[PDB]
Paper text:
In a previous work we have structurally and functionally characterized the non-canonical RdRP domain of TaV (TaVpol: residues 1-674 of the ORF1 product), showing close resemblances with flaviviral RdRPs. In these enzymes, motif C is located upstream of motif A forming a noncanonical C–A–B–D arrangement with a unique connectivity of the major structural elements of the active site. Here we report the X-ray structures of TaVpol captured in three replication-elongation states, revealing high resolution mechanistic details of different events in the nucleotide addition cycle for a non-canonical RdRP.
The incubation of Δ10-TaVpolΔ607-624/5′CAAAAUUU3′/UTP complex cocrystals with Mg2+ resulted in the hydrolysis of the triphosphate molecule, with the incorporation of UMP into the primer molecule in a pretranslocation state. In this state, the 2′-hydroxyl group appeared hydrogen bonded to side chains D447 (motif B) and T438 (motif B), which in turn was bonded to D374 (motif A). Two Mg2+ ions occupied the active site, coordinated by residues Asp369 (motif A), Asp351 (Motif C) and the pyrophosphate (PPi) byproduct. The PPi molecule was also salt bridged by K488 (motif D) and R280 (motif F) in the rNTP tunnel. The newly incorporated uracil (U+1) in this pretranslocation state established a Watson and Crick pair with the A+1 base of the template strand and provided the new 3′ end of the primer terminus. The position B Mg2+ in turn coordinated the ppi byproduct in the rNTP channel. Another difference between the elongation complexes of TaVpol compared to those of enteroviruses is that the active site closure takes place on RNA template-primer binding, before rNTP binding and is maintained during rNTP recognition but also immediately after nucleotide incorporation.
Numbering used by the authors:
A (entry chain A): 12 to 125, 129 to 546, 552 to 600, 624 to 671
B (entry chain B): 12 to 125, 129 to 546, 552 to 600, 624 to 670
The structure:
RNA sequence: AAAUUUU
RNA sequence: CAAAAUUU
RNA sequence: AAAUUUU
RNA sequence: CAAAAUUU
């Protein structure tokens, strides 16, 4: 049946899954060890210290979770919605058990309290530093109090309608028309082309993951929706089946400061799959086309930027051609509220990296409608035949971004009082944020051309954004700094962070490679707060995260490189060469430097160079058949 | 992360493994039912009759398995061999537990006395006919007695050296030189190119399957063997490690007549992996090049022939251009001892389909050496740079086919006394048989050109092959028959079987398709004796075998088509659309006819046409974005 | 599967 | 993990 | 995985 | 199943 070559491939594939034999075969194998930091104490002592810290964190979190949460009076109320009765064959779309107290759609918000990574950290670095950094922040569900507080900040903020046109958006957000999907083709194929998180909630009315809910959305609800869209019949469908247009307001689990646990917890909105999917066609095509600022000088857009393969250097070469403030144009780039501003002053280059507080709450209805228009238009320009249909989708998109009815906890249904303010979680969220941001910063530069250079000062800039745009600058982020225009080996660009990373220069054979960087404390904080079950898979997760952080820029910090190296070298060979979804290479300093330089891509150095042959139990060995006998 | 199209494919692949949900999803689906025969009796009554037949067969088999087996005096004896001590890294090549009583290599022969196919048959066809056909034959390991008797027949037969040259073999077995492997390259790659049964025994000294034993052969034993081959040092390696050149004699499990259980049990020889692989390079390349008789008028070779895609018709058009016996050349084709002879007599076309008795025992040393030479030569002609090495492999091939030392049961080692007689199991077995056969039949035709037409008669032909070639014609197989040169719809070519099948013509659209056929009794015999455990997998096996038989030609017999249809239609939908190694189509009469006709290939009709969408839970439905 | 970033 | 961007 | 075929 | 040939 099979050939020997194929039989060997077939047996190699299975050997990487037989971890007992992999462990047996790789015992005592030559191993390329990573640069590593010495161990400070034993794994058992380290477990004890980790256990201790985890306990302190659990009790502080529980404390903050017991705080009273201010009422939800600031939201309009639409009573209770009935459970959707739509059936797809043998089963209902809305499952029988879930999200239904009786008749009415209900929802229960999750705030729970309460690490192998913290253990490792205690194993390889100074106890007191690990302790205080692991107590500064924590990955958690947040608190009811801070949830409601940030929700109020983002649903009730006094906004300022922006002054925007397609002319302006063409200027600030150039794209490449020929990279837009052909949006006139059948809807089914177009929807089948979009990408999505298979594990994410499909939202109402499916109340399961998207891979679970895909057929029910696809052959049942989406055709009904289409029927009613072209029949101009949407509001009677909204009446017959309210749950089809309902969202769920949810608390984002992530890294939070512990001291601020009762003030800060991000809210976001889960939308129905059939609506998000429909809009995603346009959204994702547009993301496909959008140029970034290193490609096109007029662009204010950094959404699509990459640090790797020259990106850092590109950012530098871009920035450093900014003009004298008041005379020539500055260099401004935005990714959401995360902005990077460069400007000159008596020839000398300066940089500012400001953030905005609850940026969603500052995004105005005019801006949202203008962006939806700009996208739909960008498509129907290239593909006129479908104009009407997608315009009818635009009307939906906007009502989804500004005025969706939504659940929070239990059966009550709410809605934002004003049209202004973005419902974070809607398709296009990041783009709306980026746009509003760039529009404001463009008005800023325009005011600089009219001699208002006192807008370069914290004092007046805060006023400007508050009064002219409704943007609240997270204080202390407007601190302009002198740029080291041409850094020497090991020197920073500035100490400021853009997209969470400092820019730095490193030596490579007398060349200067621009790379990301952070101080050790930051890398260690990221190490000890992973975002999330055999011993094996956990050991592998440790390995993977170490590699990841190294690649992100931890290899360019002394202490962090040592810690990640120690983790890697602890990893048992079976776990390194394991079949996972294998890569059994580690990132050396040199390889990562190559990753960020413009070099052609290439594979990581193998941890066990001769592992393939040791596993397969067979080298090739040249045997000449032309030999004389 | 993923796209919806891909997510749906991913979800479809897993739904075909969840048989509960598969059953649920297919509950009310349209089913393309196969042509079927009505039920003769209930499932429980049929179970009772099957149980009964199984009991009678078990006790007859046990009886025949207890018979005394005549001594092994007819074989040379070389005593006991020591267990090979070669190590490959951390473990020995010869595992610690197995095939070692102490110090010495030992082997234990398996004769066990051991049906729901029979159940199905009793359910859907006449009770008495099913009973007697299921008692005529049985799939079994055989008996010690018949094992030793046939071993004696194939190791001690008085042979007749054939009269052979490369000239003759070029004539009878033409090939296409440019389809031969470039055998001058590196050995590793060439050996990696050969195909093999991954589950088969690698034989001594590995004593495990070939996929288990592949690395040990590949990076350890094969280099040692090469070293000693080019160093001209083979016999001292044979001395240091005898088990490297040892074979295992084995009893073939298969379909046996119950009446003949103590007279007939096929022996064959499992050879070492490192030797078989090395020879396979040449053997398989040559098979790649070898022409067949429907390609080349001079060829006597039918090894490579296919019934499908016109093959049957090709056989007809070939045959019917045979000449008047004594004046012009006949048409003769061989596949092992299975031969097909066509000749004319006063213009009228005749056919003969004779077989030989234990043909391996009749295969002479001259023929084996000549074939090995012909193959090695065919290669080193095209690729001279590699001559010596492959010539040294030829010497091995020959000693492997004629004179291998071998085990049977226990520790004693034996060897064939004579060089004559082929050791079935060696690489190239079928080709050696085909050549010996064709050589004899060519001498037959040559005697026909010299006016000896009484060789067309059973009485003198049997003599001819016995005396001039050592070939013993299984009696009653030389019965020449008048060919229906141009058959009408539904008529046979002749009633004779070649490659186990009758030739027949069926109608399609006023056109005649040539197809294989067998009488019902034969299809039923094959049905009730399968060759080899959940409810699921057994229910699926019934389905698979029914499909298989239908495709082989059972769809062209009424009663057999009905039985296979009934089996297929019994198969629960979950089992049809199950993820297996899916195909969830059945072979309709029309599709099988297309298979044997010259039509372009195409897939079987789905049993459940709308099953894909029912499983995925989505049928595409065009919704146009250009609507007002 | 994993790392980082934004809302 | 609601939408997303970069990377292995 | 399955069917047929030769030794 | 020891070598194999044809086939899905
Ligand atoms: Mg912010
Ligand atoms: Mg025969
Ligand atoms: Mg015979």
């Amino acid at each position: 049946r099979l050939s020997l070559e194929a039989m060997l491939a077939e047996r190699a594939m299975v050997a990487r899954q037989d971890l007992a034999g992999l462990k047996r075969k790789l015992a005592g194998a030559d191993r390329v060890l990573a640069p590593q930091s010495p161990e400070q104490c034993g794994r058992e002592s380290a477990q004890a210290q980790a256990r201790s810290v985890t306990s302190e964190l659990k009790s502080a979190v529980k404390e903050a979770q017991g705080l009273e949460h201010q009422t939800l009076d600031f939201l309009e109320q639409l009573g209770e919605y009935p459970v959707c009765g739509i059936l797809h064959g043998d089963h209902p779309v809305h499952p029988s058990g879930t999200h239904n107290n009786n008749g009415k759609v209900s929802v229960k918000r999750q705030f729970a309290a309460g690490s192998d990574a913290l253990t490792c950290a205690f194993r390889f670095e100074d106890s007191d530093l690990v302790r205080e950094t692991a107590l500064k922040t924590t990955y958690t569900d947040g608190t009811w109090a801070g949830f409601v507080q940030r929700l109020k900040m983002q649903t009730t903020r006094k906004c300022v309608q922006e002054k925007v046109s397609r002319k302006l958006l063409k200027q600030l957000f150039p794209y490449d028309p020929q990279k837009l999907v052909d949006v006139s083709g059948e809807l089914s194929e177009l929807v089948l082309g979009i990408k999505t998180n298979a594990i994410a909630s499909a939202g109402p009315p499916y109340w399961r993951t998207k891979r679970d809910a895909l057929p029910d959305m696809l052959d049942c609800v989406l055709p009904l929706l289409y029927d009613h869209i072209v029949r101009k019949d949407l509001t009677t469908l909204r009446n017959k089946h309210p749950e089809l247009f309902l969202a769920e307001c949810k608390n984002k689990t992530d890294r939070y400061e512990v001291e601020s646990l009762g003030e800060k917890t991000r809210p976001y909105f889960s939308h129905p799959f059939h609506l998000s999917a429909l809009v995603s066609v346009l959204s994702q095509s547009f993301s496909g086309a959008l140029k970034i600022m290193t490609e096109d000088s007029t662009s204010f857009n950094a959404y699509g930027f990459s640090w790797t393969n020259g990106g850092a250097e590109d950012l530098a070469i871009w920035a450093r051609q900014a003009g004298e403030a008041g005379k020539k144009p500055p260099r401004i780039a935005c990714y959401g509220d995360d902005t990077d501003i460069y400007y000159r002053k008596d020839g000398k280059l300066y940089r500012i990296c400001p953030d905005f507080k609850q940026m969603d709450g500052s995004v105005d209805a005019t801006t949202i409608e203008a962006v939806v228009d700009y996208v739909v238009d960008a498509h129907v320009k290239q593909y006129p035949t479908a104009r009407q249909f997608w315009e009818e989708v635009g009307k939906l998109w906007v009502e989804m971004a500004t005025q969706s009815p939504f659940l929070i906890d239990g059966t009550k249904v709410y809605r934002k009082m004003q049209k202004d303010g973005l419902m974070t979680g809607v398709v296009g969220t990041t783009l709306f944020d980026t746009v509003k941001s760039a529009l404001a910063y463009n008005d800023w530069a325009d005011q600089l051309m009219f001699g208002s250079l006192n807008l370069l000062e914290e004092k007046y800039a805060i006023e400007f954004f508050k009064n002219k745009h409704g943007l609240v600058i997270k204080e202390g982020t407007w601190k302009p700094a002198l740029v080291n225009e041409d850094p020497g080996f090991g020197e920073l660009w500035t100490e400021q962070k853009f997209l969470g990373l400092q820019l730095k220069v490193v030596r490579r054979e007398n060349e200067k490679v621009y790379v990301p960087n952070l101080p050790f404390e930051d890398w260690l904080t990221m190490w000890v707060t992973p975002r999330s079950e055999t011993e094996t898979m956990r050991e592998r997760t440790l390995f993977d995260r170490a590699r990841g952080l190294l690649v992100t820029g931890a290899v360019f910090d002394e202490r962090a490189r040592g810690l990640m190296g120690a983790v890697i070298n602890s990893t048992a060979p079976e776990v390194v060469c394991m079949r996972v979804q294998i890569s059994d290479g580690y990132p050396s300093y040199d390889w990562v430097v190559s990753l960020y330089s413009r070099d052609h891509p290439c594979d990581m150095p193998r941890v066990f160079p001769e592992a393939a042959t040791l596993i397969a139990s067979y080298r090739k060995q040249v045997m000449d058949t032309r030999v004389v006998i």
